[PDB]
Amino acid sequence: PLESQYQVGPLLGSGGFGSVYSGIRVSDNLPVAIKHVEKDRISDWGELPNGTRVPMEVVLLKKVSSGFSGVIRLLDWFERPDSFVLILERPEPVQDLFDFITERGALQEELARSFFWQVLEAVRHCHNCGVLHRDIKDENILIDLNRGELKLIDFGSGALLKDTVYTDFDGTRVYSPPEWIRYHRYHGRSAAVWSLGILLYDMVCGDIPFEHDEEIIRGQVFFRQRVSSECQHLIRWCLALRPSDRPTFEEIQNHPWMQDVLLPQETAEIHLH
Ligand SMILES: NCCc1c[nH]c2ccc(Cl)cc12
Numbered sequence: 001p002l003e004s005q006y007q008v009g010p011l012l013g014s015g016g017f018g019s020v021y022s023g024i025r026v027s028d029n030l031p032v033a034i035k036h037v038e039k040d041r042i043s044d045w046g047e048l049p050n051g052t053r054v055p056m057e058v059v060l061l062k063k064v065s066s067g068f069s070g071v072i073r074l075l076d077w078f079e080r081p082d083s084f085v086l087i088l089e090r091p092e093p094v095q096d097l098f099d100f101i102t103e104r105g106a107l108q109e110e111l112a113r114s115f116f117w118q119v120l121e122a123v124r125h126c127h128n129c130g131v132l133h134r135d136i137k138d139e140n141i142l143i144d145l146n147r148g149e150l151k152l153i154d155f156g157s158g159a160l161l162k163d164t165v166y167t168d169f170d171g172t173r174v175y176s177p178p179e180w181i182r183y184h185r186y187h188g189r190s191a192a193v194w195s196l197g198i199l200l201y202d203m204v205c206g207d208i209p210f211e212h213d214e215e216i217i218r219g220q221v222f223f224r225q226r227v228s229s230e231c232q233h234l235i236r237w238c239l240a241l242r243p244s245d246r247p248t249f250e251e252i253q254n255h256p257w258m259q260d261v262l263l264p265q266e267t268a269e270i271h272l273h
């Protein structure tokens with residue numbers, strides 16, 4: 001079984017997502033992350049193409065699993081009496097974006113542009129696979145430090161992507177849009193763009209722009225750090241109060257601030273190595 005297939009290493013982290021351990025697949029020494037999620041904490045359940053009852057997280061990870069390295073790859077999963085165990089790929093060396101920004105402070109715009117571009121490509125991949133992440137934030141982004149490649153993790157608050165209104169939300173409140181705070185209603189893509197605006201501000205300022213519900217609703221963006229006019233314009237556009245005033249992913253990627261992005265390897269060479 002699972003216990004013989006994997007060699008357990010130290011705890012990497014724990015929180016809303018469960019408990020994640022460093023591990024090694026015994027057959028080929030492959031680095032893995034072993035995530036444990038208690039059954040009593042799983043509210044969203046779904047079913048695989050065959051019809052087995054699994055957490056929605058497993059459904060969403062399988063839908064996004066492919067060669068594309070912008071999303072974490074689910075290698076296997078196991079059901080225990082009181083929990084589900086997920087075997088995920090583990091880049092080495094790795095650091096999540098929250099720890100990275102905490103240690104290094106506000107990012108140089110060239111670095112934020114490379115990171116933000118990769119997040120946008122990863123989110124577009126999720127949407128193309130019929131998956132809405134619902135918790136895009138620094139803590140849910142891993143940096144493969146050698147390759148300069150970012151990976152979205154923690155699909156535990158996600159949903160199947162739909163074109164109708166969402167009236168449920170269990171992601172991070174400080175990244176949630178004003179329409180959710182005010183009306184408990186949002187559409188997937190425009191709510192994702194709002195969270196991307198929060199994330200971009202966080203990258204270039206070193207902290208999130210809003211703390212309280214009143215600030216999210218007012219949506220007044222103050223820059224606490226020196227940030228270029230083009231970057232400020234893009235952030236303020238993603239953070240438009242009206243969902244219809246927000247840019248589409250195409251408009252974000254065609255924005256003047258997004259031009260001449262570095263390749264991930266160039267990004268690692270200049271900023272990470
Ligand atoms: N601080 C992030 C903790 C975490 C959550 N899901 C993961 C998947 C892979 C790896 Cl390497 C780590 C994690």
Ligand SMILES: [Cl-]
Nearest residue numbers: 072153154155
């Ligand atoms: Cl994960």
